[PDB]
């Protein structure tokens, strides 16, 4: 269960440019060759997105605010899921999203979460498809009210948008091939709606679930021999913005205008043109 790590190094965090990332489909309505103006929780264009890149690195609990844009460019699959909640203990409800090779598990329960929640990842006889997961996320899970099992959604940039509005937890996602190591790619890629969860819970904080390998063992000490948890991900925060989204012939959002970015975007959203 809970492994208490000590002398945790803080994750270094730089500030990258958002460019035009994080646009999602705001509804499930097919629109063809139009410009649709919508007011919603969007990541603003060219915003400061904080980049957490990387012994023992701290896995920080970050604020949720009005919704989280979460991107990752990883090949080791160190990020396995996220926890969401307010106290992140048994006094309040909490949301847990865990992926594996076959399924995603989404549970709203009363979790007494560990201070450093993770998954122990083990390969049986060095077989890369025989991967077993040990839950070191919570010490207890009581009065559990929601559970949902589906297909997993975890070179390739993976982007997610998490919103908690009207009693619904909405997740949007996109996976695109990129050729950058430093920062987020330019261009446009709209995030398709992944899941709407009727859970009706209060979310103010969130934390990334890591995957650690037991590299070596020390008898008597359960905090030794795990990997450092060197994970790199981008976190941005959604704000209430008006966006002018261009839907092409086949119904795909190809470009957007953030109406409050500069006077030219204000003019574009007033004229309803690009």
């Amino acid at each position: 269960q809970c492994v208490n790590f000590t002398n945790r190094t803080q994750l270094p965090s730089a500030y990258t440019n958002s460019f035009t990332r994080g646009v999602y489909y705001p509804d499930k309505v097919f629109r063809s060759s139009v410009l649709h103006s919508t007011q919603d929780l969007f990541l603003p264009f060219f915003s400061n997105v904080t980049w957490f890149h990387a012994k023992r690195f701290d896995n920080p609990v970050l604020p949720f605010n009005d919704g989280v844009y979460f991107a990752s460019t990883e090949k080791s699959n160190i990020i396995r899921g996220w926890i969401f909640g307010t106290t992140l203990d048994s006094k309040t409800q909490s949301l847990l999203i865990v992926n594996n090779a076959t399924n995603v598990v989404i549970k709203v329960c009363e979790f007494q979460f560990c201070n450093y929640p993770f998954l122990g990842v083990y390969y049986h006889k060095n077989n890369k498809s025989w991967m077993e997961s040990e839950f070191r996320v919570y010490s207890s899970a009581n009065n559990c009210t929601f559970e949902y099992v589906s297909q997993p959604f975890l070179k390739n940039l993976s982007e997610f948008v998490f919103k908690n509005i009207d009693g619904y937890f909405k997740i949007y996602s996109k996976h695109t091939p990129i050729n950058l190591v430093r920062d987020l790619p330019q261009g446009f890629s709209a995030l398709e709606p992944l899941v709407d969860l009727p859970i009706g819970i209060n979310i103010t904080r969130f934390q990334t679930l890591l995957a650690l390998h037991r590299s070596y063992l020390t008898p008597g000490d359960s905090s030794s021999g795990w990997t450092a948890g060197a994970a790199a991900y981008y976190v941005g925060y959604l704000q209430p913005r008006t966006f002018l989204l261009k839907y092409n012939e086949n119904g795909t959002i190809t470009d957007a205008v953030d109406c409050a970015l500069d006077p030219l975007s204000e003019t574009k959203c007033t004229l309803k043109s690009f």
Partner: antibody
Amino acid sequence: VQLVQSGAEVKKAGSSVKVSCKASGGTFSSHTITWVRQAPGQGLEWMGRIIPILGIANYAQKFQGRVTITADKSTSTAYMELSSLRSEDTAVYYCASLQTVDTAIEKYYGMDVWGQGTTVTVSS
Amino acid sequence: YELTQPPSVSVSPGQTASITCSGDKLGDKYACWYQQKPGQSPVLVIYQDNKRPSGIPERFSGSNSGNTATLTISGTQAMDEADYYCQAWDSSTAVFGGGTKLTVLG
């Protein structure tokens, strides 16, 4: 993690023996307490296991219906009760611990911490 | 499930000691190796067929191929005279070998 057991002792044949294993303070949060016995002149032999943080006890087929492995989170003590003692039960009873609570992960670990062993002998 | 193990292996001090452990398809299973001095608790010296716990000296090594798991000691010195137990996990039950009494000649 340190496992401390009860004292070496003698019991009646057909009596009830109650062997304790006092762990450290934070041990039962994330450990599995196995019980392994060693007869004098023979090798080790697995008797059972307990996961106290989620409260299950699994037993060997030879000891099933005879032993009952319990735990106490407040005193942090894993108990092993063995009833109907015969002459073949005189053994050193070790409590061992694994750094896992999921029993499918137990193949990736060994019994790294062991108790000092309780010598249980019987006499009419 | 049963694990077969030789009863005794005797080596010279400073030579390489090999202790085998046969089993039915043991190469598909993880085998731990435990060391027990006379009058002491067992000490885990090999887990996951080849990995040492920290604090175990580097001369202990392990392998597991086919039907046999082998514990090898390179440069056997005076503190290796013990009993060595091969342990496997079958159907989420630990099973132990008979144990080899490794002695050091004098």
